[PDB]
């Protein structure tokens, strides 16, 4: 497909099983094993797959890979080899799905090494760094609110709590493939729209809308339409 | 179907493999020890009506069939990180 | 009418507006009525009894205390016990021997 | 034995951390309950302070031992302390501040002695060997004034008869949730600054039986109320200091678990790597 000039997604349903299948094959061949018993060819076998997934003048293949951590040990050779090839990590958590927020992506543990001023530009970098700093602070103030209560919380600290609940809800979105669950038509949000929306809430324009005006809405221009009737 | 101590089946297959001088893997189990349990457990399945109709040459038409498997594994000491487990 | 408090160092026992009280004074039984001139007494162990606004009847037992009266106010500074036993000096006697032993 | 016991040790620290995480919330709730009790006590004492102000500084001016100035030849303290541990350095901070002043009067050649609330103070000052004349312990939560009548009456008896010429209360003060301070403040003689009035003592009180019995008992009740309130405010400070100490114990336990886990994953990996070197070497 890429040679046709398209841009392509390759989904790998467990890169850990690619690694173990290589361990099984090399043991049946009877090569000498390596640390933790993996094949001696482990790093080249990962490299042979991962280096074909790149962007050529013609077009590119991009890959989304499910990862498994053999003992929740992040130092084990299979994770350690895989992590050297990943550009981004997306963490899905059941705790966020309990809030009914979907997609259930944890914004604090998900990362990308493209998220840098020289790659995404300063506006994006400052916006995402802003959201991360606010959601980190809110997760601190949730301890104070729980152990001591809202009376303890200052009028500036109440403002970050009020904004973090709005930010957290505005991360939700209805998918075209999910319509049978939500009963709302799916939305596609361009990068400039999402940066402008989160930049909005952080600069304190849109401060006055109800927090449910942001949930499942779309972009921020649709949140002002939702608030007019909610 | 209940398979009691599939960990005992893996110990038997290890003995056969080492006496047959086939190369060892981790915890001395042979290389294809995953293939032993995986091909066994994948047979436990529910099959659609058109498979049953084809297999029986149409003498049974409206029914699905199934095999449900309850394998047992014994963790030596609360370790679920062993090889066979 | 006047505003009665009953209080102790531990707690407020009562507060509310009151049409009259009967209260057991140091030298004899006493009644207080609106505008009664300012008054000070210790009070004996026993009941103080009250009628709140609309003459609703309420009784409180007190171990003791001090009553005082001011224009518009009655306050009873009640306490937990007589204290006049002073047998709690004995409780200081083992504080010494346990230090010496 | 990393394959065997490091695994359990982690479980023991994990369980210990889950417990201290819960004790931080218990302490933070008891701190709230004590804070309400603290506020209720202030209005009784503040009312009684108004009465003694009116008779002491009223136009006819009375005389009483607990109220009048006296020169110093012996100095006394009474001290509040916890009956339970944890709570950080709360007790020790107060006790070393007390020893600093107790040494200051000792350098002036002035004899000192102590009355004691709580068993920590009993133990520390017996270890110092400072003279302790009276003790009360085992109040826990919901302390009562009835207990404290004992300790004050024997200090009162000492002060009136000259055996004591000054008396102080030594306690921590609950400034707020986040901060508390060890303090010493005077009880006998009455330290409080003078005040002045017209309506009071112009529309003067009828006295029964007399204004002298009513000054004596009233002072006796006031200094009692002052040390009850100090006891309650130190109790609020204990729960605050324990809440913070359990925060540190929970973070310290969480810091140890992760270092025990990096140590375990090294042992977990190394033992796999050894035994395969043996199995392959034994297939000579």
XYZ file of C-alpha atoms in Angstrom:
700
model
C 0.000 0.000 0.000
C 2.773 2.429 0.910
C 4.407 2.009 -2.498
C 1.109 3.044 -4.016
C 1.753 6.350 -2.234
C -0.755 6.013 0.584
C -0.202 6.464 4.292
C -0.982 3.233 6.135
C -1.668 1.874 9.618
C -0.211 -1.466 10.699
C -1.820 -2.954 13.836
C 0.206 -5.628 15.644
C -1.961 -7.489 18.101
C 0.767 -8.509 20.513
C 4.407 -7.679 19.853
C 5.289 -9.817 22.894
C 4.089 -12.927 21.036
C 6.334 -12.079 18.088
C 9.220 -12.170 20.583
C 8.159 -15.471 22.216
C 7.605 -17.141 18.857
C 11.232 -16.307 18.078
C 12.308 -17.833 21.395
C 10.375 -21.025 20.602
C 11.786 -21.284 17.064
C 15.389 -20.727 18.151
C 15.083 -23.247 20.990
C 13.772 -25.848 18.522
C 16.755 -25.045 16.343
C 18.800 -25.388 19.516
C 20.798 -22.191 19.542
C 22.393 -21.166 22.851
C 19.990 -19.023 24.884
C 20.622 -15.540 26.167
C 19.837 -13.532 29.262
C 16.548 -14.481 30.934
C 16.547 -17.296 28.368
C 15.585 -15.314 25.269
C 17.048 -16.053 21.869
C 20.494 -14.585 21.180
C 19.042 -12.923 18.031
C 16.385 -10.975 19.980
C 17.559 -7.433 19.215
C 18.053 -8.123 15.496
C 14.653 -9.838 15.203
C 12.962 -6.786 16.723
C 15.040 -4.480 14.513
C 14.196 -6.432 11.339
C 10.489 -5.866 11.931
C 10.532 -2.345 13.373
C 12.916 -0.737 10.849
C 10.626 -1.557 7.919
C 7.935 0.630 9.534
C 9.168 4.080 8.486
C 8.306 7.060 6.294
C 9.617 6.938 2.735
C 9.551 9.695 0.130
C 6.720 7.685 -1.459
C 4.586 7.278 1.661
C 4.603 5.937 5.168
C 3.531 3.064 7.378
C 2.574 3.958 10.943
C 2.128 1.266 13.581
C 0.026 0.723 16.697
C 1.307 -2.187 18.775
C -0.213 -3.870 21.801
C 2.436 -4.384 24.500
C 2.582 -6.862 27.395
C 5.057 -6.673 30.281
C 6.188 -10.159 31.316
C 5.939 -9.671 35.077
C 5.110 -5.993 35.230
C 8.943 -5.960 35.122
C 9.896 -3.085 32.787
C 13.576 -4.140 32.741
C 12.924 -7.568 31.252
C 14.641 -7.895 27.841
C 11.409 -8.006 25.819
C 10.034 -4.672 27.107
C 13.518 -3.139 27.155
C 14.079 -4.011 23.501
C 10.570 -2.943 22.430
C 10.684 0.415 24.256
C 13.742 1.471 22.297
C 11.624 1.393 19.134
C 8.433 3.113 20.378
C 7.870 6.793 19.658
C 4.690 7.121 21.714
C 2.841 5.293 24.493
C -0.929 5.360 25.053
C -2.219 4.023 28.378
C -5.881 3.021 28.737
C -7.268 2.736 32.257
C -10.442 1.265 33.757
C -10.488 4.034 36.381
C -11.233 6.611 33.677
C -13.769 4.292 32.044
C -15.541 4.226 35.409
C -16.140 7.963 34.981
C -17.934 7.146 31.719
C -15.229 9.112 29.926
C -14.419 7.609 26.537
C -11.929 7.214 25.015
C -10.446 5.958 28.286
C -6.942 7.350 27.828
C -4.938 8.400 30.858
C -3.550 11.864 30.007
C -0.832 11.767 32.688
C 0.806 8.445 31.866
C 0.427 8.610 28.088
C 3.477 10.126 26.395
C 4.955 11.006 23.032
C 8.525 11.978 22.211
C 7.185 14.111 19.346
C 5.757 16.409 22.035
C 8.626 18.898 21.887
C 8.852 22.553 20.762
C 11.064 21.751 17.797
C 8.596 19.176 16.412
C 5.036 20.208 17.324
C 5.786 23.888 17.868
C 5.544 26.025 20.977
C 1.771 26.605 21.001
C 1.012 22.876 21.134
C 3.867 22.201 23.571
C 2.655 24.886 26.002
C -0.967 23.752 25.707
C -0.239 20.091 26.500
C 2.267 21.059 29.205
C -0.481 23.259 30.656
C -3.112 20.469 30.725
C -0.604 18.032 32.254
C 0.322 20.537 34.990
C -3.359 21.244 35.781
C -4.370 17.552 35.866
C -1.328 16.746 38.011
C -2.335 19.512 40.441
C -5.977 18.392 40.531
C -4.850 14.856 41.404
C -2.988 16.441 44.327
C -5.985 18.521 45.469
C -8.201 15.417 45.327
C -6.139 14.177 48.295
C -6.773 17.388 50.281
C -10.467 17.379 49.328
C -10.703 13.760 50.465
C -8.671 13.848 53.698
C -9.777 17.343 54.813
C -12.596 18.630 52.573
C -13.401 21.588 50.322
C -13.350 24.197 53.124
C -9.550 23.811 53.201
C -9.376 24.733 49.508
C -8.492 28.319 48.549
C -10.323 30.390 45.926
C -7.394 29.878 43.519
C -7.310 26.145 44.252
C -11.063 25.968 43.689
C -10.453 27.554 40.275
C -7.997 24.852 39.176
C -10.462 22.212 40.463
C -13.288 23.830 38.521
C -11.080 24.027 35.420
C -9.686 20.492 35.766
C -13.205 19.018 35.870
C -13.936 20.934 32.647
C -10.658 19.865 30.986
C -11.172 16.249 32.081
C -14.681 16.165 30.577
C -13.581 17.933 27.374
C -11.171 15.031 26.720
C -14.232 12.824 25.988
C -15.398 12.309 22.388
C -18.071 10.375 20.441
C -16.709 7.922 17.842
C -18.390 7.079 14.530
C -17.887 3.390 15.406
C -19.420 3.853 18.874
C -22.727 5.420 17.764
C -24.711 2.295 18.710
C -23.582 2.841 22.297
C -23.751 6.616 22.685
C -26.680 7.402 20.408
C -24.839 10.579 19.379
C -23.250 11.100 15.955
C -19.479 10.764 15.879
C -17.203 13.816 15.689
C -13.778 14.377 14.098
C -11.642 17.111 15.675
C -8.779 18.762 13.833
C -5.546 19.469 15.667
C -5.995 23.258 15.538
C -9.508 22.907 17.001
C -8.365 20.840 19.988
C -5.351 23.056 20.728
C -7.601 26.139 20.586
C -10.213 24.551 22.858
C -7.821 23.515 25.638
C -5.939 26.790 25.182
C -9.344 28.406 25.720
C -10.256 26.745 29.041
C -6.723 27.279 30.372
C -6.786 30.974 29.517
C -10.166 31.177 31.322
C -12.409 32.115 28.456
C -15.326 29.625 28.555
C -14.885 29.577 32.371
C -18.628 30.342 32.826
C -20.153 27.257 31.089
C -21.482 24.240 33.052
C -18.983 21.376 33.220
C -21.455 19.056 31.433
C -21.342 21.439 28.465
C -17.940 19.910 27.677
C -18.691 16.192 28.025
C -18.927 14.199 24.760
C -19.395 17.459 22.874
C -16.827 17.647 20.095
C -14.838 20.827 19.634
C -15.233 23.924 21.784
C -17.400 25.701 19.183
C -19.987 22.982 19.832
C -19.655 23.359 23.612
C -21.017 26.934 23.404
C -23.944 25.518 21.402
C -24.510 22.796 24.010
C -24.377 25.272 26.915
C -27.048 27.436 25.235
C -29.599 24.618 25.657
C -28.217 22.511 28.534
C -14.106 -31.264 30.073
C -11.914 -30.877 33.164
C -8.161 -31.431 32.782
C -6.687 -32.016 36.219
C -3.076 -30.828 36.634
C -2.111 -29.699 33.169
C 1.144 -28.845 34.944
C 1.548 -32.608 35.382
C 1.057 -33.105 31.642
C 3.828 -30.568 31.027
C 6.116 -32.433 33.435
C 5.446 -35.684 31.560
C 6.177 -34.080 28.179
C 9.393 -32.597 29.580
C 10.560 -36.046 30.669
C 9.821 -37.471 27.214
C 11.665 -34.600 25.538
C 14.797 -34.840 27.690
C 15.055 -38.588 27.241
C 14.634 -38.095 23.509
C 17.556 -35.617 23.699
C 15.673 -32.635 22.327
C 17.110 -29.192 23.168
C 15.952 -27.622 26.447
C 14.373 -24.228 26.963
C 13.546 -22.255 30.096
C 12.991 -24.303 33.288
C 14.143 -27.240 31.120
C 10.855 -27.395 29.214
C 11.222 -28.053 25.476
C 10.859 -25.239 22.980
C 7.310 -26.188 21.872
C 5.773 -26.422 25.373
C 3.441 -23.504 24.575
C 2.300 -25.372 21.447
C 1.368 -28.358 23.637
C -1.185 -26.507 25.793
C -2.280 -24.029 23.139
C -3.337 -26.629 20.595
C -5.132 -28.628 23.310
C -7.090 -25.660 24.729
C -8.004 -24.138 21.355
C -10.058 -27.275 20.657
C -12.503 -26.144 23.348
C -14.849 -24.121 21.152
C -18.417 -23.323 20.233
C -19.202 -24.127 16.596
C -21.933 -22.625 14.423
C -24.957 -24.444 12.996
C -23.494 -24.676 9.482
C -20.410 -26.507 10.727
C -22.563 -29.051 12.599
C -24.807 -29.421 9.549
C -21.789 -29.967 7.280
C -20.067 -32.410 9.647
C -23.143 -34.563 10.279
C -24.047 -34.432 6.551
C -27.251 -32.602 7.400
C -28.744 -35.074 9.841
C -28.502 -32.313 12.486
C -29.512 -28.846 11.276
C -30.583 -26.297 13.888
C -28.030 -26.899 16.688
C -24.721 -25.364 17.628
C -22.312 -27.484 19.640
C -19.707 -26.664 22.237
C -16.885 -28.059 24.341
C -16.105 -26.146 27.550
C -12.719 -26.695 29.224
C -11.745 -26.142 32.868
C -7.987 -26.689 33.044
C -6.262 -26.738 36.422
C -2.806 -25.311 37.134
C -0.918 -25.530 40.424
C 1.230 -22.514 41.284
C 4.035 -23.695 43.506
C 4.052 -20.782 45.894
C 1.711 -18.045 44.742
C 3.953 -17.535 41.707
C 1.927 -16.905 38.574
C 5.109 -15.860 36.765
C 6.454 -19.377 36.232
C 6.788 -20.680 32.715
C 3.908 -23.168 32.462
C 1.472 -20.942 34.422
C -37.989 38.732 76.995
C -34.572 37.914 78.378
C -32.024 35.514 76.808
C -30.948 32.583 78.978
C -27.683 30.707 78.530
C -26.720 27.547 80.359
C -23.039 26.793 79.778
C -20.074 24.873 81.128
C -16.416 24.964 80.225
C -17.033 21.751 78.291
C -20.204 22.659 76.453
C -23.173 24.880 75.875
C -26.029 23.191 77.727
C -28.821 25.554 76.557
C -29.477 28.874 74.846
C -32.826 30.584 74.207
C -35.293 33.359 75.107
C -37.118 32.873 78.396
C -40.160 34.390 80.127
C -39.189 33.303 83.653
C -36.972 30.890 85.593
C -36.925 29.351 89.031
C -33.326 28.782 90.189
C -31.924 27.577 93.513
C -29.854 30.375 95.026
C -27.063 30.307 97.564
C -29.147 31.632 100.466
C -32.536 30.455 99.181
C -34.754 29.726 96.208
C -34.980 32.476 93.594
C -37.142 33.505 90.630
C -35.944 35.755 87.781
C -38.316 37.868 85.641
C -37.762 40.349 82.780
C -35.950 43.539 83.786
C -34.991 42.220 87.218
C -32.112 44.355 88.500
C -28.582 42.925 88.011
C -27.876 40.007 90.328
C -25.033 37.626 91.247
C -25.119 34.345 93.195
C -23.665 30.895 93.438
C -26.333 28.193 92.934
C -26.920 24.961 94.857
C -27.067 21.430 93.418
C -30.525 20.779 92.047
C -32.974 21.781 89.346
C -33.172 25.025 87.512
C -36.513 25.170 85.733
C -37.455 27.366 82.832
C -40.317 28.554 80.698
C -39.251 29.423 77.166
C -41.180 31.851 74.967
C -44.844 30.774 74.840
C -44.358 29.485 78.424
C -43.051 26.057 77.418
C -41.780 24.217 80.508
C -38.193 22.913 80.764
C -36.169 21.450 83.689
C -32.364 21.132 83.881
C -30.469 19.503 86.762
C -27.221 21.274 87.711
C -24.407 20.054 89.943
C -23.828 23.701 90.858
C -22.480 26.867 89.373
C -22.780 30.635 89.332
C -25.867 32.532 88.209
C -25.731 36.119 87.042
C -28.249 38.564 85.557
C -27.885 41.621 83.327
C -30.424 43.736 81.437
C -31.765 41.311 78.836
C -29.456 38.442 79.810
C -29.262 35.537 82.213
C -26.202 33.267 82.134
C -25.611 30.226 84.344
C -21.943 29.184 84.449
C -22.543 25.572 85.490
C -19.793 23.127 86.478
C -19.434 19.341 86.588
C -19.376 18.750 90.353
C -19.094 20.310 93.798
C -15.261 20.170 93.779
C -15.558 20.856 97.538
C -14.689 17.241 98.329
C -11.053 17.877 97.323
C -10.396 14.165 97.673
C -8.344 14.504 94.437
C -5.445 15.636 96.605
C -5.116 11.907 97.347
C -4.723 11.415 93.563
C -1.592 13.539 93.864
C -0.273 11.295 96.687
C 0.523 8.385 94.320
C 2.045 10.883 91.878
C 4.819 11.189 94.501
C 5.323 7.571 95.628
C 5.310 6.300 92.017
C 8.128 8.761 91.309
C 10.154 7.577 94.335
C 9.608 3.832 93.932
C 16.185 -15.458 49.475
C 14.781 -13.383 46.635
C 12.770 -16.264 45.161
C 11.189 -16.853 48.563
C 11.187 -14.034 51.152
C 11.882 -10.721 49.390
C 8.496 -11.512 47.859
C 6.849 -11.561 51.297
C 8.782 -8.563 52.624
C 7.214 -6.443 49.872
C 3.818 -7.763 50.943
C 4.504 -6.764 54.574
C 5.507 -3.220 53.535
C 2.518 -2.970 51.177
C 0.193 -3.964 54.016
C 1.911 -1.549 56.436
C 1.491 1.259 53.871
C -2.217 0.509 53.398
C -2.678 0.775 57.199
C -0.823 4.093 57.657
C -2.732 5.512 54.679
C -5.882 4.786 56.709
C -4.514 6.219 59.991
C -3.865 9.558 58.260
C -7.627 9.817 57.575
C -8.624 8.753 61.122
C -6.369 11.454 62.585
C -7.718 14.063 60.150
C -11.278 13.224 61.314
C -10.485 13.321 65.056
C -8.734 16.655 64.439
C -12.050 17.949 63.067
C -14.039 16.674 66.081
C -11.558 18.150 68.576
C -11.640 21.425 66.639
C -15.388 21.793 67.320
C -14.870 21.007 71.024
C -12.060 23.599 71.140
C -14.380 26.351 69.877
C -17.232 25.600 72.315
C -14.917 26.031 75.340
C -13.783 29.552 74.353
C -17.155 31.278 75.024
C -17.486 30.017 78.626
C -14.004 31.226 79.538
C -14.381 34.544 77.690
C -17.631 35.226 79.576
C -15.982 34.471 82.953
C -13.007 36.715 82.043
C -15.543 39.507 81.501
C -16.976 39.027 85.023
C -13.590 39.088 86.805
C -12.655 42.147 84.744
C -15.784 43.923 86.004
C -15.080 43.153 89.703
C -11.272 43.420 89.582
C -11.083 46.735 87.660
C -14.435 48.066 88.840
C -14.449 51.400 90.658
C -14.290 49.738 94.061
C -11.131 47.645 93.678
C -10.779 44.323 95.570
C -7.759 42.281 96.717
C -7.173 38.529 96.325
C -4.094 36.240 96.489
C -4.647 34.648 93.070
C -5.134 38.139 91.588
C -2.604 40.308 93.476
C 1.091 40.698 92.570
C 3.668 38.696 94.550
C 7.482 38.505 94.345
C 9.097 35.183 93.391
C 10.973 32.608 95.457
C 9.523 29.383 93.907
C 8.123 28.862 90.381
C 5.673 26.189 89.221
C 4.462 24.707 85.926
C 1.802 22.253 84.839
C 2.439 20.374 81.594
C 0.217 18.565 79.055
C 1.418 15.612 76.985
C 0.100 12.679 74.973
C -0.735 9.216 76.254
C -0.066 7.744 72.775
C 2.966 7.656 70.511
C 3.490 8.642 66.877
C 2.604 12.371 66.543
C 6.222 13.207 65.627
C 8.357 15.317 67.967
C 5.385 17.134 69.479
C 6.067 16.172 73.110
C 9.862 16.428 72.953
C 9.729 19.922 71.436
C 7.570 21.141 74.309
C 9.678 19.348 76.949
C 12.992 20.877 75.809
C 11.405 24.350 75.717
C 10.249 23.698 79.289
C 13.731 22.571 80.370
C 15.166 25.783 78.901
C 12.992 27.995 81.144
C 13.219 25.586 84.110
C 17.016 25.955 83.808
C 16.639 29.776 83.571
C 14.897 29.972 86.960
C 17.317 27.371 88.347
C 20.194 29.704 87.379
C 18.383 32.396 89.350
C 18.424 29.948 92.292
C 14.632 29.612 92.152
C 13.279 26.150 93.019
C 10.854 24.595 90.502
C 8.339 21.734 90.438
C 5.831 20.282 87.952
C 2.292 19.005 87.725
C 1.713 16.540 84.909
C -0.948 15.595 82.361
C -0.223 12.512 80.240
C 2.184 9.626 80.633
C 4.821 10.828 78.145
C 5.559 13.811 80.383
C 5.585 11.525 83.432
C 8.259 9.366 81.795
C 10.469 12.141 80.423
C 10.555 14.167 83.640
C 11.167 11.111 85.786
C 14.076 10.465 83.421
C 15.238 14.034 83.968
C 14.459 13.692 87.667
C 12.584 16.986 87.901
C 10.253 17.230 90.884
C 6.730 16.080 89.911
C 4.040 16.710 92.535
C 0.860 15.661 90.713
C -0.238 13.470 87.796
C -3.276 12.571 85.703
C -3.267 10.136 82.759
C -5.560 8.048 80.582
C -8.113 10.619 79.396
C -7.823 9.622 75.721
C -10.390 11.316 73.555
C -13.194 13.107 75.360
C -11.162 14.355 78.333
C -13.160 15.694 81.267
C -12.727 18.680 83.583
C -13.478 16.497 86.633
C -10.103 14.778 86.250
C -8.250 18.107 86.155
C -9.791 19.533 89.374
C -7.315 17.329 91.228
C -4.126 18.633 89.639
C -5.208 22.296 89.868
C -6.403 22.142 93.486
C -3.011 20.992 94.778
C -1.235 23.628 92.664
C -3.718 26.214 93.950
C -3.088 25.057 97.510
C 0.644 25.393 96.871
C 0.325 28.891 95.387
C -1.968 30.396 98.001
C 0.135 29.106 100.928
C 3.279 30.639 99.414
C 4.881 27.326 98.468
C 4.375 28.659 94.895
C 4.729 32.294 93.820
C 4.123 31.845 90.057
C 2.210 29.211 88.073
C 2.271 28.587 84.315
C 0.546 26.266 81.838
C 2.819 24.523 79.296
C 1.024 23.377 76.127
C 0.969 23.333 72.342
C -1.376 25.706 70.493
C -3.445 24.762 67.430
C -2.720 27.751 65.201
C -4.424 26.016 62.288
C -4.453 22.598 60.662
C -0.996 22.950 59.149
C 0.966 24.518 62.017
C 1.213 24.140 65.800
C 3.529 25.793 68.341
C 4.762 24.889 71.849
C 3.987 27.682 74.327
C 4.148 28.586 78.021
C 1.688 31.045 79.554
C 1.024 32.295 83.085
C -1.925 31.392 85.307
C -1.110 32.634 88.823
C -1.079 35.448 89.603
C -3.684 36.606 87.107
C -1.580 38.113 84.312
C -4.315 39.703 82.212
C -4.082 43.403 81.306
C -6.490 45.873 82.915
C -9.740 47.056 81.276
C -12.179 49.898 81.950
C -15.927 50.543 81.922
C -18.815 52.807 82.975
C -22.145 50.932 82.586
C -20.573 47.892 84.232
C -20.213 48.700 87.974
C -22.426 51.722 87.540
C -25.525 49.502 87.072
C -23.896 47.348 89.750
C -24.865 43.780 90.692
C -26.742 42.741 93.785
C -24.428 40.243 95.504
C -25.436 37.062 97.301
C -24.219 36.191 99.866
C -21.365 38.657 99.388
C -18.844 39.886 96.777
C -15.863 38.071 98.385
C -17.130 34.493 98.169
C -18.107 35.328 94.574
C -14.620 36.570 93.724
C -12.912 33.546 95.307
C -15.049 30.852 93.618
C -15.057 32.757 90.329
C -11.247 32.868 90.200
C -11.105 29.179 91.167
C -13.377 28.368 88.200
C -11.520 30.641 85.757
C -8.037 29.090 86.106
C -9.707 25.691 85.976
C -11.290 26.696 82.645
C -7.928 27.946 81.355
C -6.260 24.542 81.819
C -9.235 22.592 80.492
C -8.992 24.679 77.321
C -5.237 24.095 77.082
C -5.820 20.336 77.426
C -8.359 20.399 74.578
C -6.139 22.523 72.319
C -3.141 20.228 72.842
C -5.374 17.264 71.971
C -6.286 18.946 68.670
C -2.533 19.465 68.088
C -1.845 15.772 68.751
C -4.254 14.683 65.998
C -2.741 17.229 63.596
C 0.830 16.049 64.303
C -0.206 12.402 63.874
C -1.944 13.144 60.562
C 1.340 14.594 59.217
C 3.501 11.796 60.685
C 1.295 9.218 58.920
C 1.765 11.097 55.627
C 5.540 10.623 55.939
C 5.182 6.971 56.996
C 2.957 6.341 53.947
C 5.366 8.046 51.495
C 8.394 6.373 53.117
C 6.728 2.978 52.807
C 5.869 3.748 49.181
C 9.519 4.719 48.555
C 10.840 1.477 50.037
C 8.471 -0.826 48.090
C 9.791 0.404 44.732
C 13.433 -0.128 45.768
C 12.623 -3.640 46.999
C 10.976 -4.287 43.623
C 13.954 -3.192 41.549
C 16.112 -5.442 43.756
C 13.703 -8.363 43.259
C 13.538 -8.075 39.477
C 17.339 -8.336 39.376
C 17.221 -11.566 41.416
C 14.283 -12.883 39.377
C 16.195 -12.353 36.129
C 19.586 -13.547 37.429
C 18.280 -16.928 38.664
C 16.604 -17.690 35.309
C 19.864 -16.831 33.565
C 21.958 -19.045 35.856
C 19.856 -22.200 35.710
C 19.783 -22.216 31.877
C 23.565 -21.934 31.835
C 23.583 -25.055 34.033
C 21.054 -27.011 31.952
C 22.899 -26.252 28.694
C 26.295 -26.936 30.269
C 25.033 -30.264 31.604
C 23.968 -31.256 28.078
C 27.689 -31.661 27.392
